[PDB]
Amino acid sequence: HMLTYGAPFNFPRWIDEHAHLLKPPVGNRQVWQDSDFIVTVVGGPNHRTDYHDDPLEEFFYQLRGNAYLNLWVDGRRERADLKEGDIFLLPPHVRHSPQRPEAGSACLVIERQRPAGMLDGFEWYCDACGHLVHRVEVQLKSIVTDLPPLFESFYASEDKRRCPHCGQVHPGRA
């Protein structure tokens, strides 16, 4: 019986201290390692084109600045704003694409470790017809070791970007 994750510590100060990691190139920072609760602060600017299909819930608390989530709810493209001060609970499998335009912003995001055999999805959809263009499923163990080469190989492949329904080649990075 030990405090495997250390003592309590001041959160605004920790965010301040890691501001240089809460901006490009990265923009993520996991707070504690090897815990069941995956607790992360997400900065900005970042925009992305992928949608996440998380088989478990995600919790958001927009501490500083504003962000928004592009979503598919009920087959329609829908946007949930994370204004500063907002909290939000995302149910499993709602496809979501976080957009974080502001520098200096910071969002508490809490998730759980996925059990073996429970897989995450990353999807791109066609700007033109809305059809699914590409999905990869991954056994997520480390958000920053598993995810870059996924996105990267979608961007690298016109065939992965080619819409099966209208032939439009998804743009890729932006």
Q: Please tell me the distance from the alpha carbon of residue 37 to that of residue 19, in angstroms, as a whole number.
A: 22
Site for ligand 2FO in 53-112 (CB under 6 A): 58, 98, 100, 107, 109, 111
Site for a second copy in 111-140 (CB under 8 A): 112
Whichever of 107 and 163 has its CB closer to ligand 2FO, that residue is 107
Least separation in angstroms between CB 28 and ligand 2FO: 5
26 to 33, 45, 55, 168, 169: CA distances (angstroms): 17, 10, 24, 30, 27
The reply on whether position 129 binds Fe ion by CB under 5 A is yes
Candidate residues 118, 138, 143, 150; the one interacting with ligand 2FO per rule CB under 6 A:
143
Site for Fe ion in 36-55 (CB under 5 A): 52, 54
The reply on whether position 100 binds Fe ion by CB under 5 A is no
Is residue 30 within a helix (H) or strand (E), and if so which, with residue range?
strand 28-30
Query: Which residues in the chain precede a discontinuity of more than 2.5 Å between C and N?
Result: none
Which partner, Fe ion, ligand 2FO, a second copy, none, binds residue 42 by CB below 5 to 8 Å per kind?
ligand 2FO
Whichever of 10 and 145 has its CB closer to a second copy, that residue is 10
119 to 44, 52, 108, 116, 140: CA distances (angstroms): 27, 11, 23, 8, 7
Q: Is 52 annotated as a binding residue?
A: yes
Q: Is 173 annotated as a binding residue?
A: no
Any residues with CB less than 8 A from the CB of 133 and at least 6 apart, and which?
123, 124, 125, 126, 160, 161, 162, 163, 164, 170
Q: Please tell me the distance from the alpha carbon of residue 118 to that of residue 100, in angstroms, as a whole number.
A: 27
| Binding residues for ligand 2FO (CB under 6 A) | 28, 40, 42, 52, 58, 98, 100, 107, 109, 111, 143
Binding-site sequence positions: 48, 52, 58, 96, 100, 111, 126, 129, 163, 166
